[PDB]
Amino acid sequence: SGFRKMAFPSGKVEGCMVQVTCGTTTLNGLWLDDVVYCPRHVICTSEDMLNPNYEDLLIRKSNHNFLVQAGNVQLRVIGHSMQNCVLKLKVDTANPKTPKYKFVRIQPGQTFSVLACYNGSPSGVYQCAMRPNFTIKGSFLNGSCGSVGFNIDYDCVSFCYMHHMELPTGVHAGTDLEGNFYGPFVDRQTAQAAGTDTTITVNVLAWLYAAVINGDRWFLNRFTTTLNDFNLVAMKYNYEPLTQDHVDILGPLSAQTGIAVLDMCASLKELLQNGMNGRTILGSALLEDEFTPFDVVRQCSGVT
Amino acid sequence: SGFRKMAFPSGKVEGCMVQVTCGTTTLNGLWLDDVVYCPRHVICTSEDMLNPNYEDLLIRKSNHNFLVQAGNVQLRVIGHSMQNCVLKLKVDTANPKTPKYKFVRIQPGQTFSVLACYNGSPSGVYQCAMRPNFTIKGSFLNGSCGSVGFNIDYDCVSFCYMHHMELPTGVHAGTDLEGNFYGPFVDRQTAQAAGTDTTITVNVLAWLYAAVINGDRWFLNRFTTTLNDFNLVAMKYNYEPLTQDHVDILGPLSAQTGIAVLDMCASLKELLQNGMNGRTILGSALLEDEFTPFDVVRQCSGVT
Numbered sequence A, B: 001s002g003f004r005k006m007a008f009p010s011g012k013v014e015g016c017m018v019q020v021t022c023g024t025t026t027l028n029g030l031w032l033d034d035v036v037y038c039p040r041h042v043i044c045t046s047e048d049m050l051n052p053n054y055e056d057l058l059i060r061k062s063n064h065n066f067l068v069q070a071g072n073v074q075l076r077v078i079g080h081s082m083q084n085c086v087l088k089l090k091v092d093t094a095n096p097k098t099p100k101y102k103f104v105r106i107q108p109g110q111t112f113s114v115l116a117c118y119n120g121s122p123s124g125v126y127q128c129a130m131r132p133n134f135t136i137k138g139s140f141l142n143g144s145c146g147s148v149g150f151n152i153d154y155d156c157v158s159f160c161y162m163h164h165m166e167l168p169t170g171v172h173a174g175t176d177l178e179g180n181f182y183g184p185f186v187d188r189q190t191a192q193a194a195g196t197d198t199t200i201t202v203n204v205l206a207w208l209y210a211a212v213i214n215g216d217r218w219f220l221n222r223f224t225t226t227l228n229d230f231n232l233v234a235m236k237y238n239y240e241p242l243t244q245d246h247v248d249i250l251g252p253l254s255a256q257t258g259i260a261v262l263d264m265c266a267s268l269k270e271l272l273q274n275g276m277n278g279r280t281i282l283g284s285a286l287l288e289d290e291f292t293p294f295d296v297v298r299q300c301s302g303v304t
C-alpha cells in the first residue's frame, strides 16, 4: 500500500550522461554507442540565442570545438551533424555503459522520468508528464539543458525527451531524441505561448482507481453517467474528452476494483462540480493527472 | 524554475541490490563490500511472524540456507550474524559496484530517497520523509522488504533506512542499517499503533520559501509574528513547535528571498487559520512538509 509519484530507477541513464562544451556554453549530452546527443544551442552564445541561424553557426564549428567529457575523461570527437534541434557528435569510443535503448516519441498525457543533470552530472530524478499542450512541468535550472526524460521496460530504456528551454511562464519545453520539439516551440529566445493546458482525464480516473485500491473510497458515490454527459462536464472543467479507448485502457483497473469506468466517471463528475470539501485523496487536496493507467497498474502490482 | 519531489539518482544504490532467500521467504538485501544486509524476518515463515523468536529461528539456519543472488549469479555465504533486526551475511566476494558509503540514523523531519525493490530488482525511486512519529508514507508491496532509503553527498551514499513492514494503517516502518527500528515498532505481526503524526513546520516554511523563489507569492502578507505566538497556532494545527535552530536553518532561504523567518511564519499562520481558498502553492492544494530547507536550497541552486 501507499501511492507515490515514482520515477524509474535512473542507473542505466546516469551511465550515459556527459558534459558537452562548445565555446563558453556547457550543457549535458547523452552518450549511447559512439554518439553523443545534445541540444544544438550548445553552439550559441547568449547574444546568438535572440535570433539564431544554427546552420551558419555550425559552419564556424569544427570537431575540436566540441568538448565531450564523460566523468573526468575526455572523449575524442570525430564527426558532428545537426538533426533538427540536436547535435550528434560521433565519438571514437562506444559507451561501455550503453544500455538497451530505443528512441520513442511519447504522446501527450504520457508520463516519464527525468534525470536532471548539470555539467554532465546527475543531481536528481523525478516523474512528470507530457502535458496536453506539449510542455512539461519540470524542475530545471540554468545548465540542465541536455537532461533526458525516459521510460524503462525491464532492461530497455526508451528515451523520449531532451530538455532545451524554459518558457517565461516557468514551464519546460524540449525535443524527442531525433531533435523534434514537442509542441510549437522553437529553440530561440523569443516569446512563446504554450497553448491552453487541459487535465488528462484518463490519468485522473486511473489515480481515482489507485485511491480505491489503497483504501481511499470517500469519493465513491451511488451514481453513474454516460460518456457524452461526462464529457460535457469535462469540457467545462478544462478536462480532455474521454474516449472509448481511454475506457478500454481503464479496463484492468475497472476489473481490479469492480467499479465500472462510467461509475468512476460519475464520481469524478461530482468531485468536479462539488470540489473536495477539505478532504484529500491519496494525500492530495486536488485531482492528480500525472499517473497513467499503466503507471497505476505497475505501482499497485510491482513491475520491476 | 519548477519544484518537484525529487529523489537522488539511484544508480549507486541499484548496484548493491540483491535477492535474499531463506526457506520459502524471499526479500531484498543490500550488498556492500563482502556483507549483505537484509531484514532478519527473511528467516520466518508466515506462521512464525505472529510471535517470532528470532534467536531460536536463526539457530535452525546455516550459511547454506541463505541464498544470495546478485543479478543472475549466486554469491557464496560464509557467515551469518543477527544485529538487532537485520541479518548480516558475509559473502566471499566484495561487491565491485560498492559505492563510497556511510550508515547514518536520520532524525524525524529529514527526507531521503527510497529505491523500491522486488526480488533484488529495482522497480522505482521516490522521495519521502521520516515522519515525526517515525513512520514513512512510502509505496511498498509484498516483497519490497529490504528496500533502502538513502541520501547522496557528491560520491558518498548515506544509507539511513531499510524497509521491514507495513502497519495496518497503510504507513511503513523500518530500521536504520544497524537494524534499529525507527519508532516503537517491532518486527512482529501484531497491532502496532504509530503515534500522532505532526506536520514538519520547518519543512512547510522551507517549501513556502521555495514557492517565493519560483514565483508563487499570493500567500505573502503584511504581517509578522513572534516564535511564541506562531507556536500557539502551530499546536492547534498539529504542527511541530518551531525552535530557534529551525529559524537558523531557514537563514539561507530567508537571506535569498529577503523575507524574515518570522514574517514567513505569519504567512503560514494565516494559511493555517484561513486555508487556501481554492488556490494552490507550487501546484499543491495543501501545505507540503516533505522538503527540508537543505532540499529546497539543493533544488533551487542545482547541487549535483
Ligand SMILES: CC(=O)N1CC[C@@H](C(=O)Nc2cncc3ccccc23)c2cc(Cl)ccc21
Binding pocket: A041, A049, A140, A141, A142, A143, A144, A145, A164, A165, A166, A167, A172, A186, A187, A188, A189, A190, B001
Ligand atoms: C529562455 C532563454 O533565455 N534561453 C537561454 C537559455 C536556454 C534555457 O532556456 N535554459 C533553461 C532551461 N531550463 C531551465 C532554465 C532555468 C533558468 C535559466 C535557463 C534555463 C534557452 C534555450 C532555448 Cl532553446 C531558447 C532560449 C533559451
Ligand SMILES: CC(=O)N1CC[C@@H](C(=O)Nc2cncc3ccccc23)c2cc(Cl)ccc21
Binding pocket: A001, B041, B049, B140, B141, B142, B143, B144, B145, B164, B165, B166, B167, B172, B186, B187, B188, B189, B190
Ligand atoms: C504485517 C504482516 O503481516 N507482516 C508480514 C509481511 C511483512 C510486511 O509487512 N511486509 C510488507 C511491507 N511493505 C508493504 C507490504 C504490502 C503488502 C504486504 C506486505 C508488505 C511483515 C514484516 C514484519 Cl517486520 C512484521 C509483520 C509483517
